[PDB]
Amino acid sequence: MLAKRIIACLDVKDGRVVKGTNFENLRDSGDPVELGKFYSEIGIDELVFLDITASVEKRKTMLELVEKVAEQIDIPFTVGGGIHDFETASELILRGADKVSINTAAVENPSLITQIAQTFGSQAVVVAIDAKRVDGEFMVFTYSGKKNTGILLRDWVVEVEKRGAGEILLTSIDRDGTKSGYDTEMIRFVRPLTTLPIIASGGAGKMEHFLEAFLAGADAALAASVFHFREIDVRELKEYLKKHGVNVRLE
Numbered sequence: 001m002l003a004k005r006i007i008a009c010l011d012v013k014d015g016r017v018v019k020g021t022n023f024e025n026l027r028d029s030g031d032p033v034e035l036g037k038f039y040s041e042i043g044i045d046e047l048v049f050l051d052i053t054a055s056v057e058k059r060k061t062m063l064e065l066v067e068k069v070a071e072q073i074d075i076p077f078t079v080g081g082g083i084h085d086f087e088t089a090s091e092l093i094l095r096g097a098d099k100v101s102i103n104t105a106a107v108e109n110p111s112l113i114t115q116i117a118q119t120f121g122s123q124a125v126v127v128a129i130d131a132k133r134v135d136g137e138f139m140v141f142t143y144s145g146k147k148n149t150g151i152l153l154r155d156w157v158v159e160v161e162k163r164g165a166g167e168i169l170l171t172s173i174d175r176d177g178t179k180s181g182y183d184t185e186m187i188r189f190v191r192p193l194t195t196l197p198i199i200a201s202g203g204a205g206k207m208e209h210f211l212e213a214f215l216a217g218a219d220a221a222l223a224a225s226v227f228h229f230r231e232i233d234v235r236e237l238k239e240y241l242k243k244h245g246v247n248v249r250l251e
Contacts, residue, residue: 003247005045005220006210006234007199008227010035013052015061021228032065037072039227043234044075045249048101048169048222051081058082063095070096078126078169086115093120101169103128104142107149107156110163117164126199127165129156131186132173138189145173153186157193168194169222171201179205179226184216191217207232207240214246 080101
């Protein structure tokens with residue numbers, strides 16, 4: 001549908017939620033599987049798990065996470081963090097993930113988008129784009145924000161859709177980590193350039209920020225610590241959005 005989605009992002013490392021949560025009701029407030037299940041039960045529409053485990057155990061660790069998450073939830077989930085090639089993406093989808101997120105590897109080899117899409121469908125391929133204003137232009141950054149690629153956001157969005165991606169996870173480096181709001185200027189910039197769903201990421205601090213993101217043209221809104229630390233309640237968020245005319249899924 002044209003229903004707007006609320007997505008929780010769980011940063012994970014060695015099978016734990018990085019920085020934990022304030023959910024004292026859980027058996028283990030830092031267990032990403034139990035946390036993901038909890039979120040599915042309280043109204044989150046999809047999950048994104050981003051792993052930062054050391055290379056040696058990373059492959060096994062991501063596969064174990066996917067297997068364990070898949071048995072507990074029925075809502076869509078994406079896995080990402082250091083997916084560099086088709087075989088890695090393939091194993092993760094087969095083990096249970098609905099989608100994979102790719103970022104630096106896609107920029108370095110855009111054919112990777114097409115390669116994954118040809119087997120798993122475009123809907124399986126989320127391209128995460130991290131962008132920042134530099135000298136008055138929106139530029140694409142790789143390596144967790146460390147590298148200005150010199151590629152314009154405008155050009156890369158178009159290329160990503162051409163290559164067969166299914167969704168764009170758009171993170172503003174200028175808002176990420178803050179609580180001042182989503183980068184609606186950046187969302188509005190991207191919206192006319194692509195037909196793909198856009199997941200807004202970075203800057204959420206209060207319920208109103210979600211409304212603003214949707215008005216800007218996002219199809220989904222992603223957040224992490226605002227949910228994990230109970231600054232925003234998911235059901236209350238959905239109530240609020242529905243009240244103000246946004247098409248959310250609200251049972």
